[PDB]
Write a protein that binds this DNA or RNA. Structure first.
Ligand SMILES: [Mg+2]
Ligand SMILES: [Mg+2]
Ligand SMILES: [Mg+2]
Lengths: 134, 114
RNA sequence: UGAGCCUUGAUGUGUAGGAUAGGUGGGAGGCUUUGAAGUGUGGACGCCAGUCUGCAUGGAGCCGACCUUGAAAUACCACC
RNA sequence: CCCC
RNA sequence: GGCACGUAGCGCAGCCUGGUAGCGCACCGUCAUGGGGUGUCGGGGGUCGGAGGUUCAAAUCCUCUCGUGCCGACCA
């Protein structure tokens, strides 16, 4: 159904096993199979019901290592597309770039939230099987 | 193409553009092209401006758009001044060309309301 | 035998207009020989307009950007 | 269908 | 607290399940008939109870509100 490429990268991760932070920065060389500076996307699953006008999010990220000042905004259903950078930008520094992202959000945590704000952080790759960390 | 200032009678024959001009009709165009010395077998897109300004000068002898409706309105103000039957009828917004009014004037009196 | 549910399968005619296109949206190389585009046809959905899969003949060839769209392609990837 |  | 009704004069679809107020009765003027009705034919007649937001746009989504219901709860 596929070529040799797509299958071995899906057989290098686990979706039923929600990976961890320090375990996450080992596999993005096995999740990077492109002949350029390929990107790595992040998704943030959220824990509010945004069907109400009061729950829009909007802000800019001061990147601790640049890429770099990127804006963001949540979704109406609870999953926002963000980014940490690329796969070659010092994977070990990618964890420290994951650090600075989310601590800025809980500071601007909206007061009209219902339930828990965050749900899950998927540090996924652009050309491989995603990773959903707690 | 420019005659009269505002009207563009493009691709109209020499006298057809003048019949289609604002102010005059069927025979005054023939009269204009006879007083100016031009034939009526070609469109306006072939005659140069050396004669179009002459046509616009020659048509400057009749009543034009700005005085057409204003002479009409001077007459209508004479109607609003006198009080005669055609002032009374005209002051009720009623059709425009003769005498019969009872049973059939419906196009210019509008459709039936109820 | 319904309910909740992971994986997978798989999904939501607008008109515009290459285009059955969900909210975003990182994104320009995937694709390719663990064995092409066109076709040979059994099956699925269908407002049946089109999406589209098993074994293949063909067997190594297309495309993101490339134009008109409230929208760009679901090329990869992302959680629902 | 009603009625003269 | 908890869910169900508001849509032309009347009864409702659509509903308080997404893009474009529709059906029936009522009313007006025709046609149908020797005279009438049913019937076909057109025309008015409402902006979805009110407000506020999401939209490429609400009626059809969400919040408050209004009138009416029904279940339940209620030890200044
Ligand atoms: Mg009259
Ligand atoms: Mg008899
Ligand atoms: Mg009491």
């Amino acid at each position: 159904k596929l070529t040799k490429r797509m299958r071995v990268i899906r057989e290098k991760v686990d979706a039923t096993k929600q990976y961890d932070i320090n375990e996450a920065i080992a596999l993005l060389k096995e999740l990077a199979t492109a002949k350029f500076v390929e990107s790595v996307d992040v998704a943030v699953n959220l824990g509010i019901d945004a069907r109400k006008s009061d729950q829009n999010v909007r802000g800019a990220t001061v990147l601790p290592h640049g890429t770099g000042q990127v804006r963001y905004r949540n979704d109406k259903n609870g999953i926002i597309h963000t980014t940490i950078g690329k796969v070659d930008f010092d994977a070990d520094k990618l964890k420290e770039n994951l650090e600075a992202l989310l601590v800025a959000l809980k500071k601007a945590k909206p007061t009209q939230a219902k339930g828990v704000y965050i749900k899950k952080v998927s540090i996924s790759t652009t050309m491989g099987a995603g990773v959903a960390v707690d | 193409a420019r005659i009269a200032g505002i009207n563009i009678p493009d691709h109209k024959h020499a006298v057809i553009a003048l019949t289609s001009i604002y102010g005059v009709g069927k025979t005054r165009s023939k009269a204009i092209l006879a007083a100016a010395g031009i034939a009526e077998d070609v469109k306006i897109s072939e005659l140069s401006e050396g004669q179009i300004d002459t046509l616009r000068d020659e048509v400057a002898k009749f009543v034009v758009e700005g005085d057409l409706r204003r002479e009409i309105s001077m007459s209508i103000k004479r109607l609003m001044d006198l009080g005669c039957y055609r002032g009374l009828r005209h002051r009720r917004g009623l059709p425009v060309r003769g005498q019969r009014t009872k049973t059939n004037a419906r196009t210019r009196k509008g459709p039936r309301k109820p």
